[PDB]
Subunit: 37 residues, 3 copies
């Protein structure tokens, strides 16, 4: 009962979310360090 249109859409979305989250892990590691001052 599940089309390839929606499944593929969702996998693209998930992939974009992955790359965004790479950037964000970068920012949070940036912020955490240098949080000693």
């Amino acid at each position: 009962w599940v089309s390839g249109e929606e499944f593929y859409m969702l996998t693209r979305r998930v992939l974009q979310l992955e790359t965004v989250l790479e950037g964000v892990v970068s920012q949070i590691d940036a912020v955490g360090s240098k949080l000693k001052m």
Copy 2:
């Protein structure tokens, strides 16, 4: 193959919640900078 549209619905929800939380953390981080 095994589809289970209800299952896909659950995953969609999960993705929406995850996007929401993500929005939230981008927020809290961006603010945290001094």
Copy 3:
């Protein structure tokens, strides 16, 4: 069309984003608690 295995693979990718995310939340919440 259909999935089976493909759906599993996607769910594992989402599960991994969820976990990374939760790590980030722990972190930013700790820093937030350091005020």
